[PDB]
Structures are given as structure tokens and as C-alpha cells.
Design a protein around this ligand. Sequence first.
Ligand SMILES: [Cu+]
Ligand code: NA
Length: 105
Amino acid sequence: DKATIPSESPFAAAEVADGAIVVDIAKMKYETPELHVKVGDTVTWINREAMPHNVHFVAGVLGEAALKGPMMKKEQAYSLTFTEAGTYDYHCTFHPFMRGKVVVE
Ligand SMILES: [Cu+]
Ligand code: NA
């Protein structure tokens, strides 16, 4: 697969790492919908609002099957570590019109 998962479950936003690369979720949008990172970087999404959200990569994008992230409540976080260059689109399972991408250089 093209990413690894440091926290299977959502975790508290207060425990986001050291200078972490963060994508905030608010107002039904990923706030940084075109994020550029490098191979080896970890991206952390943080839901800033009451409406639950997740991140969802369709089958084939990060592995043979879809990567459906866990439901994230307000001030919950979820991370993925990208190990291969490429562009990886995602959406919110609950709200598929909400889209973003990670561009890994
Ligand atoms: Cu959503
Ligand atoms: Na912002």
C-alpha cells in the first residue's frame, strides 16, 4: 500500500504531533484541499466542527481496496503517512461532494 496509519482510530486534536502537517475540516470543506507534501510525510486531518467527517480514498488509490477513514467528531484527528510519490484524491464518505487531494513529491 501507499500509506501507513499511525492511529487506527480518531485521536484527540490536543495530541497532534510536533509541527505536524495539518488539514483542518470546517464549513463542510477540507480547508487545504490541494496539499503538497514530500515522500515520507504524515498528514493529519482535524475536524473543527460538530458535523462528523472522515477521509476516504477509493479502491486502487492507496491500496487494492478503498481506505475509508474512521468517523471524526469535533476536535478529533486522523493521520496518514505517504510513502510513494503521486497524487491521491479523497472525499468525505458522509459528504462526497467534499473533496481534497494530497500531492506527494
Ligand atoms: Cu463530511
Ligand atoms: Na484554515
